[PDB]
Design an enzyme around this catalytic site. Sequence first.
Site, PDB file in Angstrom:
ATOM      1  N   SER A   1       0.837  -1.198   0.000  1.00 25.09           N
ATOM      2  CA  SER A   1       0.000   0.000   0.000  1.00 25.09           C
ATOM      3  C   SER A   1       0.868   1.242   0.000  1.00 25.09           C
ATOM      4  O   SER A   1       2.044   1.190   0.367  1.00 25.09           O
ATOM      5  CB  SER A   1      -0.893   0.018   1.243  1.00 25.09           C
ATOM      6  OG  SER A   1      -1.648   1.215   1.330  1.00 25.09           O
TER       7      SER A   1
ATOM      8  N   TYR B   1      -2.402  -1.578   9.967  1.00 21.52           N
ATOM      9  CA  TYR B   1      -2.305  -1.668   8.521  1.00 21.52           C
ATOM     10  C   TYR B   1      -0.973  -1.093   8.026  1.00 21.52           C
ATOM     11  O   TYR B   1      -0.305  -1.720   7.202  1.00 21.52           O
ATOM     12  CB  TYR B   1      -3.499  -0.951   7.871  1.00 21.52           C
ATOM     13  CG  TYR B   1      -3.544  -0.982   6.354  1.00 21.52           C
ATOM     14  CD1 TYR B   1      -3.959  -2.121   5.672  1.00 21.52           C
ATOM     15  CD2 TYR B   1      -3.196   0.143   5.603  1.00 21.52           C
ATOM     16  CE1 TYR B   1      -4.023  -2.150   4.291  1.00 21.52           C
ATOM     17  CE2 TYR B   1      -3.255   0.125   4.205  1.00 21.52           C
ATOM     18  CZ  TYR B   1      -3.663  -1.024   3.562  1.00 21.52           C
ATOM     19  OH  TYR B   1      -3.728  -1.045   2.190  1.00 21.52           O
TER      20      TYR B   1
ATOM     21  N   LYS C   1       1.870  -3.589   6.433  1.00 16.52           N
ATOM     22  CA  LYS C   1       2.134  -3.328   5.022  1.00 16.52           C
ATOM     23  C   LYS C   1       3.573  -2.865   4.803  1.00 16.52           C
ATOM     24  O   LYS C   1       4.163  -3.128   3.744  1.00 16.52           O
ATOM     25  CB  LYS C   1       1.130  -2.329   4.447  1.00 16.52           C
ATOM     26  CG  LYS C   1      -0.280  -2.893   4.288  1.00 16.52           C
ATOM     27  CD  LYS C   1      -0.334  -3.981   3.230  1.00 16.52           C
ATOM     28  CE  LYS C   1      -1.727  -4.117   2.648  1.00 16.52           C
ATOM     29  NZ  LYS C   1      -1.693  -4.764   1.315  1.00 16.52           N
TER      30      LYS C   1
END
Lengths: 263, 263, 263, 263
Positions: C144, C157, C161
Amino acid sequence: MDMGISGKVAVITGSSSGIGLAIAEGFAKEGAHIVLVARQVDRLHEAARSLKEKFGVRVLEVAVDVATPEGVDAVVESVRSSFGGADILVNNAGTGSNETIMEAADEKWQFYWELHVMAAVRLARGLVPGMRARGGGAIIHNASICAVQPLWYEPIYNVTKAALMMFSKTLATEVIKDNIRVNCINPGLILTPDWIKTAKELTKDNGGDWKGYLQSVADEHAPIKRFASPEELANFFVFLCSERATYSVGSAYFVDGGMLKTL
Amino acid sequence: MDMGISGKVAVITGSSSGIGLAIAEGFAKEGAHIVLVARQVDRLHEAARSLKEKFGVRVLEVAVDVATPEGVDAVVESVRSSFGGADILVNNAGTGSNETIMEAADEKWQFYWELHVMAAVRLARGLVPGMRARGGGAIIHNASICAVQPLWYEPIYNVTKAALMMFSKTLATEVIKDNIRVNCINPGLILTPDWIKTAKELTKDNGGDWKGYLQSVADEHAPIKRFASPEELANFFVFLCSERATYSVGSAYFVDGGMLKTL
Amino acid sequence: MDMGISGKVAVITGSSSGIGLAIAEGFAKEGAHIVLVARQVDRLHEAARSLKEKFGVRVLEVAVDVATPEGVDAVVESVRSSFGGADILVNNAGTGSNETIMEAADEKWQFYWELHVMAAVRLARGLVPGMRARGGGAIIHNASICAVQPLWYEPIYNVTKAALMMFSKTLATEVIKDNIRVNCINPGLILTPDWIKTAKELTKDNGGDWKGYLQSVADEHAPIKRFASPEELANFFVFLCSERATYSVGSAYFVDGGMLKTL
Amino acid sequence: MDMGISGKVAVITGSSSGIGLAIAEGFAKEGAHIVLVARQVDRLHEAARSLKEKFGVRVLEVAVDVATPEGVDAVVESVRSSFGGADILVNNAGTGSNETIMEAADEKWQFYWELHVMAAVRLARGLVPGMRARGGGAIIHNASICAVQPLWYEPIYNVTKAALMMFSKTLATEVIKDNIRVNCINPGLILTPDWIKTAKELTKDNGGDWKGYLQSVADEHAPIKRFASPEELANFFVFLCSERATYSVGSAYFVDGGMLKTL
């Protein structure tokens, strides 16, 4: 913590006022002798006397333009004749820009290139020999958060500050053999004369709430939600030029209060 | 995958040979009309005819020096009169350097600045209006792995390639409103004429094993342990300028075979 | 451009909907056979029907949880039995988070670690041996933009990531010897069902204008001023796994419409 | 320079030897009270004796495994009971790895995740509340140069240190509201017992010249051509947790003697 800076010779560009002066004040506190370099002759006098009167250090004034070879040459000669050489170089001279790529003149691109990159380049060529002969030392480039994270309205500043940041890195690898540590500091929002003045000019037509304007810039850009004092920034320059930072080589240190949005 | 490039006008600098030519060949395969820009007049003829004879595209030759305002001006006028404007700009013109900061002349710093940065700057000012009027398009800057990861022997190349990389990014944010996507490609070791020639010159006194020399450079720097063909690199330029890459804006794409040692 | 992947075997995780499905359609378009991996059994049956009819390729459906070691074991065995091995692996399985570090439970930290990092680790050591015996292949991690530019509301997250992005580069260094290219894609704002459902939730009490919400997220974050279609992101996955991207090894490619604020 | 941390309470993990101990001596020198956290009980008793006698500060010893939730709970409770809370937290606990992705067990992936990432997560949410009630403080994560520049032989160390570096920045964004500054330090080659023991192991069959081995690791990797003493690294931890570094928020600082190859 003893910085081990006492008696050392520190040459600082852009030092008549603002960030440059606070850095010079930081070195003076630690007993460093100071070479002030700036364009503004009168402000140079102000600054030098203030350093003498508050800190009792030796201060040499060099009133020249570092964006030109002649100006840099003058610096190195003043340093050579007064002190023999320098132990510390701080490249602080520079200014923001304000333009679009589509409408800016070639002359302006050239100007910032001479100011932000060629000055650091010329001062390194000039002062490194004396520094090399004195047993080593420290060089710092004051780039900007903009060298990595561009601000939309100043492309030329962004480009030339990124060039400076890379120059710092390449210089670092060239001169470390000479016991010269070269690093780079990237300040975020620093409360300068320039910032206050642009806060005055932009609010003169809507009520002159200049502190309100500054606060909203800080709220927008920095998670710490304030500008830094030039004194706060100064602390980092002094420590990086000290004998306590002997393993810092070719690095880029951010002092931005969270403003950098990337790892 | 249909690139949607057929009939588009692609202007490529440094395209008489090597990387520039292979990029131009990549566009020709996809049916793009091609404006070749280079210094070497005869090699320009060679290249243009080869493109015509292999691919059947229209080819316009502009034999100028993009490191000067006059040269850039000529490009934009040739483009305007022949095609109306350009849809694709690829800034490929440039050369490695070879020096120390301590011993290089100011004139050389200036030269690479004019070649690597000011050319991209001037070609953008010049070609963006026509591009804007044609409904948008793509610009690519060929910087280098050296824009991020400096090679020890070429500081000026490092500095000016980092300036180019930042310029790409700032341009990207300025022109995206005009449906113009600006990106940047950073090639690693690409098997060029320049590389083979320096392999010939460096081994002429030790047995002339030039493929052995190249292989050891690749073994040293790239985990894939080979140079790339210019054709391999070309693929990436074509795709990034295509209607299949419509979300690529202000990015830096590395094509380096593992050579980049950082995230 | 001929992608050169017709007859290749593409394993894609999280491929029952959204980006995963759009990626799988991208590969199917180019003649690749597909292993659809997802949790939902009926959604898989239906995606598989679309791909077989619309493109005419072989489609295997593996209904498992890749966040568990058992789930990945079943993917491996199913590929082994049906195709023998994979030529292409796309790790797309994942989900955004929402929490403060101060409040989040350890279970939540573990889940996203299993899902974003461990899934790719397990699929790598599981599918690599088969991939090398087939002559080599390609692997892409969909991390991401948050792996480099963290969003304030989803720290887990961001962390996981970021770990994945580094995993991608470490795998790249290790498996390029087996002719396996590993690269990473970092998408920006992509128009997915989760964004749509998020926009509906967030606007339920202030007018229900979910489109207006999404537009303002784009305006704030992305200079292109819009979300990407999953389709335009898929293009990049396809190209990077193709025979046209043979020099891409251990790179991170941003598809973010200018969202990344640093170069 | 006055660090302004006399009377402050510094919690340091992995502090029975090497870098952790050198960091703790750095803080003790500046008048800070110390919470020594480590696994080995007798090594702790002895380090605590040195600090009390040599510097004259209060020293708490917590003999626990911070890689477990129970270990961190005991650190929290012990700080609570003895001091009430912490002003400074340094997450240093950690270890290098050695494996291939293809061979490594899932257990090994989990261990380093618990040790490098989860330890800091748990110590953060455990010590933060006490830290904010004391008026704020400082937190430093000792990640590694490997968090950005991966070493080929230790992929797990690379991934988990990369996750930690991003955790550091996400925590910084969240807790600066409570006047808590979070920063990250990324050391290069530091002369630790593990390097010494590694050099002895690696040279046992070729002459036992462990110093010559270490010298050649420096020559290959670091332009400064030497390892850092733990002492010179500690300086940086101290300064960054002091009242002189009040504008450092969410930054990553490299102390690598030029090892980082990219800017």
